[PDB]
Amino acid sequence: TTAVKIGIIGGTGLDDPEILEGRTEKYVDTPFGKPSDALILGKIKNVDCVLLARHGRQHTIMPSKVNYQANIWALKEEGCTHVIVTTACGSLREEIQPGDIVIIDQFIDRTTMRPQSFYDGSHSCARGVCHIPMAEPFCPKTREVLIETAKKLGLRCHSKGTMVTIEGPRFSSRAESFMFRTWGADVINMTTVPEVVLAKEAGICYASIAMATDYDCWKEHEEAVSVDRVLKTLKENANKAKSLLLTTIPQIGSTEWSETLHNLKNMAQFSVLL
Amino acid sequence: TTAVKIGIIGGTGLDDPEILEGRTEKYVDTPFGKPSDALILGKIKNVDCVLLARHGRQHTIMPSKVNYQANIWALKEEGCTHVIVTTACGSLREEIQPGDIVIIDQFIDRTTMRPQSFYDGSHSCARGVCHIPMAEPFCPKTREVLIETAKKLGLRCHSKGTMVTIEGPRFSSRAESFMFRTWGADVINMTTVPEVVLAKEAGICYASIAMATDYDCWKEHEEAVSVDRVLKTLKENANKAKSLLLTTIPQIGSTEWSETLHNLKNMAQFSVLL
Amino acid sequence: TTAVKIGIIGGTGLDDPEILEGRTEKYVDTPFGKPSDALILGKIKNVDCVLLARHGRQHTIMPSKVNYQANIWALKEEGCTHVIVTTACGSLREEIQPGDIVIIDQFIDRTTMRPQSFYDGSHSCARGVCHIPMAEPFCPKTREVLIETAKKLGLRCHSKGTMVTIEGPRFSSRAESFMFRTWGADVINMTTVPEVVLAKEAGICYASIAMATDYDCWKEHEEAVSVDRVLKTLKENANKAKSLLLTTIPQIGSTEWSETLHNLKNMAQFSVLL
Ligand SMILES: C#CCCCSC[C@H]1CN(Cc2c[nH]c3c(N)ncnc23)C[C@@H]1O
Ligand SMILES: C#CCCCSC[C@H]1CN(Cc2c[nH]c3c(N)ncnc23)C[C@@H]1O
Numbered sequence: 036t037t038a039v040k041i042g043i044i045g046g047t048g049l050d051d052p053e054i055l056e057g058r059t060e061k062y063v064d065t066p067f068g069k070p071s072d073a074l075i076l077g078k079i080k081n082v083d084c085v086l087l088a089r090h091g092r093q094h095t096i097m098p099s100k101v102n103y104q105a106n107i108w109a110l111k112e113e114g115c116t117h118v119i120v121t122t123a124c125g126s127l128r129e130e131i132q133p134g135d136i137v138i139i140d141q142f143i144d145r146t147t148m149r150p151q152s153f154y155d156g157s158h159s160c161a162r163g164v165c166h167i168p169m170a171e172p173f174c175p176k177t178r179e180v181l182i183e184t185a186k187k188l189g190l191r192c193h194s195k196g197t198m199v200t201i202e203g204p205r206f207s208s209r210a211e212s213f214m215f216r217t218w219g220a221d222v223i224n225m226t227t228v229p230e231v232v233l234a235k236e237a238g239i240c241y242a243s244i245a246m247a248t249d250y251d252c253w254k255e256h257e258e259a260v261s262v263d264r265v266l267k268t269l270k271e272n273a274n275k276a277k278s279l280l281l282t283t284i285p286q287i288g289s290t291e292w293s294e295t296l297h298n299l300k301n302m303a304q305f306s307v308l309l
Numbered sequence: 310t311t312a313v314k315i316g317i318i319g320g321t322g323l324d325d326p327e328i329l330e331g332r333t334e335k336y337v338d339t340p341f342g343k344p345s346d347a348l349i350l351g352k353i354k355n356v357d358c359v360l361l362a363r364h365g366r367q368h369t370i371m372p373s374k375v376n377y378q379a380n381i382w383a384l385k386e387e388g389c390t391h392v393i394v395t396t397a398c399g400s401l402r403e404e405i406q407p408g409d410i411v412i413i414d415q416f417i418d419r420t421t422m423r424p425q426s427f428y429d430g431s432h433s434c435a436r437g438v439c440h441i442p443m444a445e446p447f448c449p450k451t452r453e454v455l456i457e458t459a460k461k462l463g464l465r466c467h468s469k470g471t472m473v474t475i476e477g478p479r480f481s482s483r484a485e486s487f488m489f490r491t492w493g494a495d496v497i498n499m500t501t502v503p504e505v506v507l508a509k510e511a512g513i514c515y516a517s518i519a520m521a522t523d524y525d526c527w528k529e530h531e532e533a534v535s536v537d538r539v540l541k542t543l544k545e546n547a548n549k550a551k552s553l554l555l556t557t558i559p560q561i562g563s564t565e566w567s568e569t570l571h572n573l574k575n576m577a578q579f580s581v582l583l
Numbered sequence: 584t585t586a587v588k589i590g591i592i593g594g595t596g597l598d599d600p601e602i603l604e605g606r607t608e609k610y611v612d613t614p615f616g617k618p619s620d621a622l623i624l625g626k627i628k629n630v631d632c633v634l635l636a637r638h639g640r641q642h643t644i645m646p647s648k649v650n651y652q653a654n655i656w657a658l659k660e661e662g663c664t665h666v667i668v669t670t671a672c673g674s675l676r677e678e679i680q681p682g683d684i685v686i687i688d689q690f691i692d693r694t695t696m697r698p699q700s701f702y703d704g705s706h707s708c709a710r711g712v713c714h715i716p717m718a719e720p721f722c723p724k725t726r727e728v729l730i731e732t733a734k735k736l737g738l739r740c741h742s743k744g745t746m747v748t749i750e751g752p753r754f755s756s757r758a759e760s761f762m763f764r765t766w767g768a769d770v771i772n773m774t775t776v777p778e779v780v781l782a783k784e785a786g787i788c789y790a791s792i793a794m795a796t797d798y799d800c801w802k803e804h805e806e807a808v809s810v811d812r813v814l815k816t817l818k819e820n821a822n823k824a825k826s827l828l829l830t831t832i833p834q835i836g837s838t839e840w841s842e843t844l845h846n847l848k849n850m851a852q853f854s855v856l857l
């Protein structure tokens with residue numbers, strides 16, 4: 036019943052403006068600098084959406100240099116209640132095949148260079164000390180809709196998974212890939228952290244459609260990851276994320292989020308000492 | 310017999326000037342910038358002490374932004390032989406209950422943004438390349454006095470423990486919390502590193518009174534950590550750290566430290582190539 | 584048959600200009616700043632070499648402050664086909680004794696402060712987004728020649744090993760040392776990452792002669808590492824790295840590298856989106 040507005044952050048090979056009807060481009064500024072690119076405002080059926088290319092529409096910005104703060108701030112300022120993203124990733128598990136979707140529910144941070152809070156003491160818009168809880172980083176209700184929708188579409192989709200986010204831009208060594216497996220990581224990328232953290236500070240329902248593109252390099256005997264391999268797999272499978280977003284978003288718009296959003300707002304508010 | 314002077318760095322909820330008699334405020338400057346707040350000079354029985362609030366007296370400075378270099382430099386310059394600190398922490402072990410003290414003896418670094426040496430090539434006050442040993446990061450003699458004193462006070466106190474120090478300011482994910490358990494971490498915080506490292510470079514006997522405030526989030530079925538929960542536990546248990554400091558410090562002042570301090574000075578001196 | 588030119592980066596205690604005949608000093612500038620010190624141009628038998636002291640010839644630059652980008656860029660610009668380095672390290676395995684050489688084949692990154700790519704968006708000389716593969720970070724053909732040569736010299740030499748590279752400049756805690764063992768690390772240093780990563784981006788055959796100098800601190804009951812201990816072990820064993828380089832380099836110059844170099848060039852080229 037109450038209004039939703041869905042932010043969509045498109046990842047590698049997975050950032051297609053044609054998903055939205057009635058599109059208008061809008062460049063914005065934020066207190067944390069410029070977002071990766073213009074916001075694309077539009078609709079999926081009756082639902083207002085805001086699309087943003089994580090790496091810029093020409094994929095010019097490497098993961099370490101993405102302005103996660105500006106991206107999330109921009110989407111919050113536009114009125115987004117939800118941020119649903121796409122992310123390419125490596126599979127660290129035999130059962131997660133290239134082309135599979137994983138509706139991730141946890142992460143392990145391996146990043147090093149990245150601001151992870153709006154509350155850095157330098158911005159009048161975000162005053163105080165903020166310690167956000169990360170026990171449940173992703174919105175379970177949004178994830179549930181994604182999982183059910185993937186099933187209705189007949190897609191190979193894993194209902195949970197732990198993403199290890201590496202700094203990059205290099206891929207992992209084999210020793211690192213083996214190690215991440217022992218830590219219980221299921222998939223590997225370069226962008227989930229701090230995007231998920233900042234969304235939680237913003238009181239936004241965040242979920243991630245991870246698409247496996249390769250098996251990283253933990254099969255010593257088999258093909259290891261490369262840029263060409265990742266891009267080829269995405270070319271083959273991008274349609275699945277598009278269909279999943281197109282079908283999921285109207286279902287989100289048809290249910291009631293006020294309580295979910297209130298609880299997230301309170302968790303965020305009570306994490307700050309002003 | 311020989312003179313000691315005890316630096317006290319107060320952590321979250323645990324930075325109370327009333328612990329000292331004959332108090333005088335003194336703001337100082339250092340070659341690494343300003344300390345978190347004024348030094349509070351005073352006494353516990355006959356022993357000279359110097360108190361400093363890690364996060365500022367109004368808790369305005371998040372862990373990533375604490376000027377660990379300036380804090381330790383300021384205390385060294387004031388003549389501190391010892392630095393005994395308090396730190397709130399999460400428990401990663403069932404037997405470490407909220408309200409328990411842990412006299413930690415090891416750490417695992419998960420920080421990323423932090424200068425860990427005075428010897429960065431930029432300061433004429435700290436010339437050369439310094440590689441400090443960290444096999445035994447905390448002073449065992451100071452820890453021993455803390456442990457015995459806690460026993461005399463009847464406090465629930467663990468005689469050792471490994472602190473994992475995360476960058477923050479977010480709390481850990483559940484996947485991270487589980488992972489740290491597999492690494493052998495016992496408690497979790499955001500401030501031990503690089504404070505302990507810089508104290509060792511300074512040739513100061515350093516020890517830490519860690520106070521468990523929560524169980525982080527590794528019980529999937531139970532209450533996870535939040536700011537409100539941490540602050541509530543500290544309100545309930547702060548008196549214990551205060552009593553432990555009040556009772557420990559006179560005992561430190563009543564024994565002989567010249568040899569201990571000489572050995573630390575030599576370890577620090579011989580870590581530097583000028 | 585086709586020409587090779589060997590860059591040599593000398594590590595701690597292991598950066599000796601006397602290894603080259605017909606020496607000439609050449610200071611250079613790069614788009615990433617100045618290298619650690621002058622390039623020393625010279626020969627080993629008929630083979631052109633370029634020597635560079637990682638830490639400066641007076642060991643004035645700590646690992647975190649080494650300009651890995653400028654060093655690798657400088658060697659590439661001088662025409663190096665190969666970069667063979669020396670690195671002191673701690674042993675995390677009983678069978679790797681101090682004085683042993685380890686021809687490492689993998690790494691685990693524990694660094695936090697370091698640029699790991701030339702492609703940072705800020706340099707016109709390195710345009711685009713680059714994601715370099717790290718499955719096999721070290722050149723197996725160069726490693727093979729090192730291993731066979733060490734055998735011909737009768738040296739204690741391990742044919743593979745995983746290096747964990749820590750940020751430093753502090754040494755590891757005991758809890759960290761134990762943890763790295765569980766991760767499958769064999770040796771520990773502060774310099775392999777990002778040196779190896781940048782060499783791969785440059786399309787250079789990179790290999791590392793690691794020399795164990797200590798057992799870090801994982802024997803709770805035995806001597807732990809210190810600067811004095813490291814430097815003493817290197818004084819005793821430096822001749823071995825020198826002899827290994829002197830004997831290996833002519834063998835490299837006597838075989839054909841065009842295909843190996845072509846494959847590395849293509850891997851690097853196809854990692855970049857322009
Ligand atoms: C150059 C260029 C265009 C991008 C080519 S593929 C690299 C992107 C895909 N993205 C996710 C990813 C897929 N497979 C991975 C892997 N195996 N490790 C880490 N990240 C990934 C990382 C990076 O942003
Ligand atoms: C906002 C505000 C005031 C501080 C509220 S609690 C957060 C502080 C407590 N401190 C220690 C701590 C307690 N429980 C923890 C946990 N579970 N993980 C990491 N650190 C902690 C971290 C941070 O400096």
Ligand SMILES: C#CCCCSC[C@H]1CN(Cc2c[nH]c3c(N)ncnc23)C[C@@H]1O
Pocket residue numbers: 438439440580581582595642646670671672673674749754755771772773796797798799800808809810813814
């Ligand atoms: C001060 C000074 C001169 C250097 C003294 S020894 C420290 C260098 C040796 N280098 C390698 C190393 C040897 N043993 C190690 C250990 N146990 N841990 C990490 N690194 C090392 C680290 C650093 O660059």
Ligand SMILES: [Cl-]
Pocket residue numbers: 145419693
């Ligand atoms: Cl780590």
